[PDB]
Structure formats: structure tokens, C-alpha cells
Amino acid sequence: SPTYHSFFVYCKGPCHKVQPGKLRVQCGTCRQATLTLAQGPSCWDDVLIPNRMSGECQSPDCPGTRAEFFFKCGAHPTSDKDTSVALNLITNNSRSIPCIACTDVRNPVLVFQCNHRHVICLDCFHLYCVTRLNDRQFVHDAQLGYSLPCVAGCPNSLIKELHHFRILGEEQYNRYQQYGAEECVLQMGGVLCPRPGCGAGLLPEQGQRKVTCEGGNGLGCGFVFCRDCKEAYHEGECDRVDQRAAEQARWEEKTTKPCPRCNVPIEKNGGCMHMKCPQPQCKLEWCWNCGCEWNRACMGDHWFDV
Ligand SMILES: [Zn+2]
Ligand SMILES: [Zn+2]
Ligand SMILES: [Zn+2]
Ligand SMILES: [Zn+2]
Ligand SMILES: [Zn+2]
Ligand SMILES: [Zn+2]
Ligand SMILES: [Zn+2]
Ligand SMILES: [Zn+2]
Known part of the structure; x- marks a missing residue:
């Protein structure tokens, strides 16, 4: 069996890309991996929202009870300080739901938070992002920043995270981070350097037709152009969705398994994989997905499932 990954993170290095991640927990007081939970997480809310969960710290002389969750890259060994951000939209495609754009079944996939919960693969999510970024069609949000909604155009589907x-990559991501400053330069009546390589945000004298690509702190490529036609400076004068694919690509379209040791059936209590046999004779703790004894690798790879 290949490893079942519930979690995906963006690793700042050495990976510099999206990788499967490991879920971890520590005492919110002492910041040590000694926080014991009465019952494990079952959803993203349990791990993303501060103080949502509780437990008891096994550390000597620590009164902490706050469960603090973080993720790590799974590609390589990592310090417990080397945390990565969770891409909580990215989902294990257990259900084999087709993509909304290429109609291929891939894993993992991004699931929007609209009502239909449309599904899109990471390669097609990249394309959607780069297009929107080039056509300068990101949506401004109220002090949130620039985001995108579901590719279907659904309402209440802006990506909050x-x-x-x-996932665009360092080049495209840098552009996106600079999206606002570009928008604002233009709103101030400024202009962008026409040279595709440069594209500096310039604020030449109002009215001035001759613009030189130069600016604050050494910025500039030295190109000298006309502000009206964007050509080099001249003396004289200028001269998406398929309706069927979108219905197929919906996240919302097995409930009991026999205990592995004793065989009495158990019903799945939430999204948590940690199964505890209530049967006195047996009392096997096991992983709902893998059917094996409960263990750290399971916690890290898929403590809960979505
Ligand atoms: Zn990494
Ligand atoms: Zn503690
Ligand atoms: Zn949607
Ligand atoms: Zn796709
Ligand atoms: Zn320039
Ligand atoms: Zn001109
Ligand atoms: Zn049992
Ligand atoms: Zn497992």
C-alpha cells in the first residue's frame, strides 16, 4: 500500500513546493510534544482554530491543557521547529471525483468552499491562477487581500487561506504578492514598464508623455517610452466551465467495519481515524483506514480524514 496522505503543506525549503505533510500537536503552554488528547482531531476546524481542543500535558510540572497543532513537510527529516503552513483546501481524492476542467481523476485535489464544493486538480488550479493573474482579474477583498473564487464562478467561494x-511557484507567487502594489500604481495614474521582463511600477510626472523606467532605490531598466502607446519614445504622434464537468466535479457525490482483532463491528465516529474497540476482551486501538494497530505514522499521515 502507498501512504495515505490527508494533509498537504507548502514547504519553504528545501522543497519549495507543495508536499504531503505530517500533523503534530504540542502543549500550548510549554511547547513540548507531551500533550495527550482525550480524543483526537476529526476535522480541519479542530486543528486550525486556536484552543478548539484540549488535553493534559504529561510534562513534569506543567499545567498546560491547550492543544496546539502544527504541520511539517513530509519529504525529509524536519525539526519540530520547522513548521509549514497547511493548505487546508487540498484534499485526498478518496472519492475519485473528476476534475472540473480536464475531467481527469487525480490526487490530491483542491476543493472549494462554495455550496456545491467543486473539485479541481492542482495542475488545473495552477492554470486558473496564472491566467487570472495575467489578465489581472483577481478579486479584491475587504482588507483580506487578493483571492480567487471557485472556477465555476460560484458565490461565497473566495479562498480565505x-x-x-x-502552489503557483516562487515566480508567480511573487507577482501575486505584488498584485496590490501594481493595482495601486495604476490607480494613482501611474504606468507599468512595457518591457515584459521588467514591468516596473512607475509614477512619472502627471501629464508627462516621455517616461523613463527608473525609480526608488535603483529600481528601473532604463527603457524610455511613450506613455500613450507604450512603444519606445517617439518625437511625433501615436498611431469558462463545462456544465456537465461541473456537475461531475462535486465533492458530495463504509460506515461500519469489523474490529480487526475481535471482529465486533464499530461505527465511524467522526473523521478521526483513531478507533478504540469498546469490547473488554479486546480493547484494540486501530486505524480506520489501514486496519493496523494505532501508531504515530498514522497520526502524522492521517489523524483524521476528509
Ligand atoms: Zn520539504
Ligand atoms: Zn506543557
Ligand atoms: Zn464552485
Ligand atoms: Zn484538472
Ligand atoms: Zn523597465
Ligand atoms: Zn506614442
Ligand atoms: Zn476488538
Ligand atoms: Zn493509517
Whole structure:
């Protein structure tokens, strides 16, 4: 069996891309991996929202009870300080839901938070982002920043977790981070350097037709152009969705398994994989997905499932 990954993070290095991640927990007081939970997480809310969960710290002389969750890259060994941000939209495609754009079944996939919960693959999410970025069609939000909604155009589907734009790659992501400053230069009646390589945000004298690509702190490529036609400076004068694919690509379209040791059935209590046999004879703790004994690798790879 290949490893079942519930979690995906963006690793700042050495990976510099999206990788499967490991979920971890520590005492919110002492910041040590000694926080014991009465019952494990079952959803993203349990791990993303501060103080949502509780437990008891096994550390000597620590009264902490706050469960603090963080993620790490799974590609390589990592310090417990080397945390990465969780791309909570990215989902394990257990259900084999087709993509909304290429209609291929891939894993993992990004699931928007609209009502229909449309599904899109990471390669097609990249394309959607780069297009919107080039056509300068990101949506401004009220002090939130620039985001995108579901590719279907659904309402209430803006991505709140802006780090999901890291999946564009460092080049495209840098552009996105600079999106606002570009928009604002233009709103101030400024202009961008016509040279595709440069594209500096310039604020030449109002009225001035002759613009030189130069600016604050050494910025500039030295190109000298006309402000009206964007050509080099001249003396004289100028001269998406498929309706069927979108219905197929919906996240919302097995409930009991026999205990592995004793065989009495158990019903799945939430999204948590940690199964505890209530049967006195047995009392096997096991992983709902893998059917094996409960263990750290399971916690890290898929403590809960979505
Ligand atoms: Zn990494
Ligand atoms: Zn503690
Ligand atoms: Zn949608
Ligand atoms: Zn796709
Ligand atoms: Zn320039
Ligand atoms: Zn001109
Ligand atoms: Zn059992
Ligand atoms: Zn497992």
C-alpha cells in the first residue's frame, strides 16, 4: 500500500513546493510534544482554530491543557521547529471525483468552499491562477487581500487561506504578492514598464508623455517610452466551465467495519481515524483506514480524514 496522505503543506525549503505533510500537536503552554488528547482531531476546524481542543500535558510540572497543532513537510527529516503552513483546501481524492476542467481523476485535489464544493486538480488550479493573474482579474477583498473564487464562478467561494497561492511557484507567487502594489500604481495614474521582463511600477510626472523606467532605490531598466502607446519614445504622434464537468466535479457525490482483532463491528465516529474497540476482551486501538494497530505514522499521515 502507498501512504495515505490527508494533509498537504507548502514547504519553504528545501522543497519549495507543495508536499504531503505530517500533523503534530504540542502543549500550548510549554511547547513540548507531551500533550495527550482525550480524543483526537476529526476535522480541519479542530486543528486550525486556536484552543478548539484540549488535553493534559504529561510534562513534569506543567499545567498546560491547550492543544496546539502544527504541520511539517513530509519529504525529509524536519525539526519540530520547522513548521509549514497547511493548505487546508487540498484534499485526498478518496472519492475519485473528476476534475472540473480536464475531467481527469487525480490526487490530491483542491476543493472549494462554495455550496456545491467543486473539485479541481492542482495542475488545473495552477492554470486558473496564472491566467487570472495575467489578465489581472483577481478579486479584491475587504482588507483580506487578493483571492480567487471557485472556477465555476460560484458565490461565497473566495479562498480565505492566501497561502494556497504558493502552489503557483516562487515566480508567480511573487507577482501575486505584488498584485496590490501594481493595482495601486495604476490607480494613482501611474504606468507599468512595457518591457515584459521588467514591468516596473512607475509614477512619472502627471501629464508627462516621455517616461523613463527608473525609480526608488535603483529600481528601473532604463527603457524610455511613450506613455500613450507604450512603444519606445517617439518625437511625433501615436498611431469558462463545462456544465456537465461541473456537475461531475462535486465533492458530495463504509460506515461500519469489523474490529480487526475481535471482529465486533464499530461505527465511524467522526473523521478521526483513531478507533478504540469498546469490547473488554479486546480493547484494540486501530486505524480506520489501514486496519493496523494505532501508531504515530498514522497520526502524522492521517489523524483524521476528509
Ligand atoms: Zn520539504
Ligand atoms: Zn506543557
Ligand atoms: Zn464552485
Ligand atoms: Zn484538472
Ligand atoms: Zn523597465
Ligand atoms: Zn506614442
Ligand atoms: Zn476488538
Ligand atoms: Zn493509517
